[PDB]
């Protein structure tokens, strides 16, 4: 064939054809207004819809004449554990930072106590309440990176979620039967370049982020929006400049996405043994982000999605 | 020997407070450990926030800043081989900063204090501060071996990072937050007229450097160096070599060299102590908090503390209300944690950290790109650099 797509993820199916950015929605087409950051015993509802001016969120032979997937071009869409990223010659460079924690996630048959996605930036550790339906809620707890889910009974999970999320004046967390308990990792990684000859990387094969900020899929999509158009210009108008600049343009937008994702991750989680000045700057960062127009503006523009080149 | 407010330290914070109190009729005595001639000739550059300039102007000591203070509109951030001129006057909607050296602020304030007969004791190091919950506080000092005591309603601890007032808090009350960064600054003056007029920051992966105007014919230059560094390990040739490497970009004039003088090394540290008051003791300025000099914030923060403290003391003596004294620390700390955030953000973005994680290192360029390249980034920089509001 012309284009050999490795991996059948959301990036692999978007080229052949959680929380989503407005750009990801319109790309699929072609509903969130605020996040409640809780800290210091108080709710801080950051209306990013208003601050953003109306944007919203929603819930072998790569140098030869032909490439061979054991086609003209190979689209690496095989995620963080695929083989496409290692399919390059000294060409690749890796930027890696793992965070000293994971997330314990549950799906509960209980109505959300509030309609906004809620971030509990507690000194016990991070917690998050997100919705799915008026009767189904999605919840996360910061936990040890290698945590055994068997150590967390249903009662332990609800107790800790209450401690990390409840504040006076807001409805308390509603409890219900628990489904889909699991532990997921927290890691920042990016690899350069994102192309080499006939091999083009996208999505998790190129770069992973911590889920704080909901960017891993939305960046995979923008990766595909760019790779798809370049292949269109190549096959339709005989124009190869877009393919040659694929890595350059994806990396520009992604390094700003890594920035935002990491900024949230390092702000809302507790780091064991951290320098006490750096630890107190987490609250200063939360106060500035929620409490000033400039802080709210930067959050709103980044959360709803950066432009795509 | 008896007064209303005893002020420990005749640096900018103490002199400003003595001056404000004098014009409100409130009696104060300033006690300073060094010699007047020493304090008067401590030369230090200075970038003043607009609020600081307004404060000096409204206290009758802004005449010379109004006459020769050099209005500053932009910083040139150099990285990735290019200049990025961030116009914070535009980004902030018209607020700005002024280049006006700290030693001339101190000259201005000392002249105002002397013209108002404010009593200042020099060569009189304070040894203890006691009676913080007595009817009147006691400042125990010595000139030579002569023991002295000043009795006062309130003690303003304006004696800097190395003073005695911070340690006079009951240690079960005070909490410190401290980070020493793993680098210092090698600083020089060069007898060469500045090639570019803007404050210029070299922020590339080769290491931090800074260039600014000391005077029309003298350039101030800083280089990131090792924290314990001997200035004698930096010959003139090594200095110019590193400065060219860290600052020069195509499309901007190359560095103008000239005689090097005033070579020295300074440390980089973020520190804040809580609370800023206990009983009759109120801390202000470097006695309470210091920042790394990226961002031009230490003197301006000391002046913000003094603005709040003087107004609280006026409310107490003039209007008989003590609630503003009661909230001094709460209000000053809220601002100062945001100043610490800003100074720290600049410091961790523009310096190379030895052995740093390569992902975290590359986010430095992402942060520079976002701060210079987006309206939202420029706005935040500009509002912080020109000065946050004061409560
Ligand atoms: C807990 C959690 C929450 C998240 N929340 C959000 C969110 O709210 N918003 C958001 O935008 N993102 C979110 N993400 C990130 C997002 O889910 C991922 O970034 C996304 O899966 C990336 O898509 P991808 O197709 O590139 O990778 P994947 O989805 O991992 O696709 C890789 C595919 O390739 C296949 N494959 C692997 N190796 C090979 C091989 N050798 N040959 C063939 N096939 C192979 C795999 O089996 C898999 O099907 C979250 C991630 C986690 C873990
Ligand atoms: C190189 C450099 C550049 C800077 N640039 C800027 C800038 O552009 N903008 C900015 O806002 N800030 C800047 N700063 C920070 C600023 O200089 C300080 O924050 C400022 O000096 C703080 O003033 P202060 O009155 O609190 O303390 P200090 O100036 O330290 O004065 C304290 C005084 O107390 C006296 N004292 C100490 N112990 C005793 C004792 N026991 N008894 C009596 N007296 C005592 C000392 O002798 C001294 O005179 C810079 C700092 C440096 C090092
Ligand atoms: Ca088990
Ligand atoms: Ca007594």
Numbering used by the authors:
A (entry chain D): 3 to 19, 46 to 58, 71 to 99, 130 to 140, 152 to 170, 172 to 391
B (entry chain A): 1 to 391
Provide passages from the article that reported this PDB entry.
Para-hydroxybenzoate hydroxylase (PHBH) is a group A flavoprotein monooxygenase that hydroxylates p-hydroxybenzoate to protocatechuate (PCA). Among proteins in this clade, Xylophilus ampelinus PobA (XaPobA) preferred PCA as a substrate and is the first known natural PCA 5-hydroxylase (PCAH).
We initially determined the crystal structure of XaPobA at a resolution of 1.6 Å. The imidazole molecule was surrounded by hydrophobic side chains of Val199, Met210, Trp201, and Phe385, and a hydrogen bond was formed with the main chain amide of Thr294. The Arg214 side chain, which anchors the carboxy group of the substrate pHBA in PaPobA, swung out and was not in a conformation suitable for binding to the canonical substrate. The main chain peptide bond of Thr294-Gly295 was notably flipped in the XaPobA + imidazole structure, suggesting that the Thr294‒Gly295 region was flexible due to the absence of hydrogen bond between this region and Cys347, unlike PaPobA.
